[PDB]
């Protein structure tokens, strides 16, 4: 998504600079800059203008990290306990 997203970004921005140079028309017009400005709801440029989205950035990662911390704790309790149980039952009772 970064590759195919930003390669057409560079291919077009070089042809859009070529406009002033040569190949005018296409002017276009106007479709080029119009939806580019719809892309401009967030630029995102220096730096990210996330002052409102900063605390919200980690706040979306809030529960994702919490559950990942909560699941791996009990999944271990399912994995660690049950493995030790069944292991020593076969291991030591055989010899």
């Amino acid at each position: 998504h970064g590759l195919k997203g930003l390669n057409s970004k560079l291919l077009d921005i070089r042809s859009y600079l070529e406009k002033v140079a040569t190949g005018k028309l296409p002017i276009n017009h106007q479709i080029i800059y119009q939806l580019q400005d719809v892309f401009n709801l967030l630029p995102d440029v220096s730096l990210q203008e996330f002052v409102k989205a900063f605390y919200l950035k980690t706040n979306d990662q809030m529960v994702v990290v919490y559950l990942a911390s909560l699941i791996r704790s009990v999944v271990a309790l399912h994995n660690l306990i049950n493995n030790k149980i069944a292991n020593r039952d076969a291991e030591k009772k055989e010899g």
């Binding site: 017009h29 106007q30 400005d37 401009n40």
Partner: protein, 93 residues
């Protein structure tokens, strides 16, 4: 010369009626701007105020300098269009 007096009233009347909110989309079209070279230059400089502008407070008054009539009712209205034209640009620029 017939079309240089066409853009005379074309720029005026097109700016007068506010039913069209944009009006600046194709204003850069090549065939009309060739007429805008021979047309009176102060009318085009105030058209660039509504084309880009916006203020340029001296130019939006300039259209009321040369041509008095038909602009009296739309004067305070065209003063409103430049006020909504900056709101989009200052965040766009």
């Amino acid at each position: 010369s017939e079309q240089q007096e066409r853009a005379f009233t074309l720029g005026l009347a097109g700016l007068l009626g506010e039913g069209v909110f944009n009006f600046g989309e194709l204003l850069m079209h090549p065939v009309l701007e060739s007429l805008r070279n021979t047309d009176r230059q102060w009318l085009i400089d105030t058209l660039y105020a509504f084309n880009s502008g916006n203020v340029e407070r001296f130019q939006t008054l300039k259209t009321a300098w040369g041509q008095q009539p038909d602009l009296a009712a739309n004067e305070a209205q065209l003063l409103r269009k430049i006020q909504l034209l900056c709101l989009m640009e200052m965040t766009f620029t």
